[PDB]
Structure 1
Amino acid sequence: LSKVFTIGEILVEIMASKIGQPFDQPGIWNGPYPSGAPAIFIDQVTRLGVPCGIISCVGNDGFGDINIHRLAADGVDIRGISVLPLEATGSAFVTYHNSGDRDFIFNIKNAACGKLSAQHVDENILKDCTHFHIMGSSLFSFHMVDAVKKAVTIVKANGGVISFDPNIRKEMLDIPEMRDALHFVLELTDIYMPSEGEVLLLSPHSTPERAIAGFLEEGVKEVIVKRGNQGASYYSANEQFHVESYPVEEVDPTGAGDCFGGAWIACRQLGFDAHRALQYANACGALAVTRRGPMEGTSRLMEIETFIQRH
């Protein structure tokens, strides 16, 4: 009955079929593919066998259906996904440069996703929610923050746990309203999971150490740092440790952080200790980047176990 819930953008991704393919010339594209950091995160949670749900908004179109179908089939409680007739399901077109850099044409802010208001958050859907996960990338409007704030109040009310992944767009930091929202969340966060490049973003300090130790002082219980292709680290007032990255043929990093986080949250729900959870989250993130597609790199528990072993 205990459930892990997340909230945020759900969209489909349409990928360029060839590297170097431009946006301003006819070509071949592949998709749609289920996507959206919160959706990818929750999909990893369900594939690990942990009952979960997601609060989102999609339009009444096939793009919205493919996401709902995928999540539902994978075991996710999809009741929290409202369908908006007068809106188009968010999307994202992506191309690849020879350098490895990606280019996107996003439609999220002015699509169904950016419609999610505090009213789409039903207290009845979060009754059995003991753990709520927030994606920084979701906070791009006041309506979004309200929904998130409402949900967090409801979950902490029933004694739930709050985790927060600051995977935002740096630009958002130059907006006072959104700047506060992020800090507001950080203050109510028990589990903080920034990537190496985001540790200082929400910190008054200038060094990762001070930043991490600062977070713990503020009230954060755990800080998990994803160091891209350099491993990751676990930080708690009582302990501290790190694991190394696995050497893999990177193909698509789009959802490596979401998968890493899904594995961490789910593994911890399954009783794993911080050390086991960390190596698994790391292995999960590593396995994810090896497959093309935002949500096509998720893994089952023993696939992660085996990945680790064979290495």
Structure 2
Amino acid sequence: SKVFTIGEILVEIMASKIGQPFDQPGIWNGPYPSGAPAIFIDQVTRLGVPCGIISCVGNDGFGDINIHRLAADGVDIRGISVLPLEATGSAFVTYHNRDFIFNIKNAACGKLSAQHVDENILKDCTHFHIMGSSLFSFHMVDAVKKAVTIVKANGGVISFDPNIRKEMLDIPEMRDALHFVLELTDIYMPSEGEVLLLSPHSTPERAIAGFLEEGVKEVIVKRGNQGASYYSANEQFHVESYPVEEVDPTGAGDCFGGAWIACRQLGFDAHRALQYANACGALAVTRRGPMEGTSRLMEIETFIQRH
């Protein structure tokens, strides 16, 4: 029983100071392993659940830091193809109080396609997770479509976190790609701000009811500093947030998701899984760095206990 994801893998370069602009020489920190699917799958493995990822990186040091990190953490990296003529994706980020310069679409991670999805790699996959952020081109979609149908046809469970960029919604083809995934989704994990996106219904209550009636088995709604909710035909509950000192919210959704999926793989019931997921996301935001907020079971449990 293995958990698999697919998508962009990149390195993040972070500005050394708040307010630091992009158009002035300065000091930066990095590279740091990154990319929503990678963060998610890193959290899954740190919780002791077998998993793998399908992506494309370039034949360079930036691709290496990612492969090395995931591999050392227990992730099956056979699915990460290395592209000699492409540069590994990157993202420069600066703060205020947030701002980015992305090289994802036209980078190695954007070369992912059906040809780079090895069906044999998914032969024993029981759960496949999709990040909406990965659907930014026809090839990304073809890759996702191929992997999802292989797993679904093999009786696997599909989970989907629509962490998309609102822009993609104005693009029919991407809008249709998102509808595709949802149509085959068992576990839908939108944040409150994303609940209405892929629904013909205008009120959240109505949208969620719609997802269930359409085929989804469970809807997990992330509410940031307000906690999280769980919805199924069988039950419905909510958990309050754990008050923490937020530093970086960029990996909260990814970690919360990996925790939910991993805990469920470990046999946790909905209530316990939601509690751990909630605590995992809270812990993630207390540290800077994309993948620096993932936690292991012991840390999550101690955090819960202390509260």
Q: TM-score, normalised by structure 1?
A: 0.98
Runs of 4+ aligned structure 1 residues displaced above 3 Å come to none
CA offsets 1:209-232 (integer angstroms, 9 cap, x no match): 001100000000000000011000
Is 1:34 the counterpart of 2:30 in the alignment?
no
Quick one: distance in 2 between partners of 1:163 and 1:51?
Answer: 16
C-alpha displacement of 1:153? 1.2
Cα deviation, residue 175, structure 1: 0.4
**Superposed CA offset, 1:26-75 (max 9, x none):** 00000000000000000000000000000000000000000000000000
CA shift for structure 1 position 302: 1.7
After superposition, what is the alpha-carbon deviation per residue over 1:211-270, rounded to whole angstroms, capped at 9, x for unaligned? Answer: 110000000000000001100000000100000001111011111000000000000000
How big is the shift at 1:150?
0.5
User: Partner of 2:226: helix, strand, or coil?
Assistant: coil
**Cα displacement (A) at 1:93:** 0.2
Alpha-carbon distance, 1:310 to partner: 0.3
Once the two structures are TM-superposed, the CA of residue 9 in structure 1 deviates from its matched residue by: 0.1
Structure 2 match to 1:85: 84
Distance in 2, matches of 1:213 and 1:4, equals 27
**Counterparts of 2:107 and 2:215 in 1: how far apart (Å)?**
35
Query: What runs of 5+ residues in structure 1 fail to find an aligned partner?
Result: none
Q: 3-state DSSP class of the match of 1:31?
A: strand
Match of 2:304 among 298, 301, 308: 308
Q: 2:186 aligns with which of 175, 182, 190?
A: 190
Deviation (angstroms), 1:13: 0.1
Over the matched positions of the two proteins, sequence identity in percent amounts to 100
- What residue number does 2:173 align with? 177
Does 2:151 correspond to 1:155?
yes
Q: Deviations over 1:121-162 (max 9, x none)?
A: 001100110100000000001111111110011111211100
| Corresponding position of 1:259 | 255
Q: Secondary structure at the match of 1:257?
A: helix
The answer to whether residue 206 in structure 2 is matched with residue 207 in structure 1 is no
CA root-mean-square deviation: 0.5
- For 2:201 and 2:221, how far apart are their aligned partners in 1? 16
Q: Secondary structure at the match of 1:241?
A: strand
1:272 match: 268
Q: How far apart are the structure 2 equivalents of 1:166 and 1:143?
A: 18
What is the CA-CA distance between 1:18 and the residue it aligns to?
0.3
User: What's the CA shift for 1:196?
Assistant: 0.9
Partner Cα separation in structure 2 for residue 227 and residue 214 of structure 1: 19
Aligned length: 307
Query: Could you tell me how far 1:116 is from its partner in structure 2?
Result: 0.1
Report Cα offsets for 1:154-204 as digits up to 9, x if no partner: 111211100000000000000000000001110100000001110000111
Counterparts of 2:174 and 2:229, CA distance in 1: 28
Deviation per CA, 1:89-117: give whole Å up to 9, x if none: 0000000012xxx0000000000011001
Three-state SS of the structure 1 residue aligned to 2:43 is helix
- Structure 2: runs of 5 or more not aligned: none
Taking the aligned partners of 1:303 and 1:213, their CA distance within structure 2 comes to 35
Are 2:229 and 1:233 equivalent residues in the alignment? Answer: yes
Confirm whether residue 7 of structure 1 aligns to residue 3 of structure 2.
Answer: no
Write the distance in 2 (CA, Å) between the matches of 1:258 and 1:132.
14
Distance in 1 between the 2:285 and 2:108 partners? 28
Deviations 1:262-301 (A, max 9, x none): 0000000000000000010000000000001000000011
Distance 1:72 1:274 in 2: 30
Q: Distance in 2 between matches of 1:180 and 1:236?
A: 25
Secondary structure of the corresponding residue to residue 144 of structure 1: helix
- Further displaced range: 56-65 or 299-308: 299-308
Cα distance in structure 2, aligned partners of 1:29 and 1:299:
25
**Cα distance between partner residues in 2 of 1:307 and 1:156:** 36
Look up the match of 2:242.
Answer: 246
How many Å separate the matches in 1 of 2:115 and 2:231?
A: 36
How far apart are the structure 1 equivalents of 2:48 and 2:115? 29
Q: Which SS does the other structure have where 1:71 is aligned? A: helix
Rounded to whole Å, the distance in 1 between the matches of 2:36 and 2:66 is: 12
Shift, 1:14, TM fit: 0.1
Query: Structure 2 CA distance, aligned partners of 1:302 and 1:192?
Result: 27
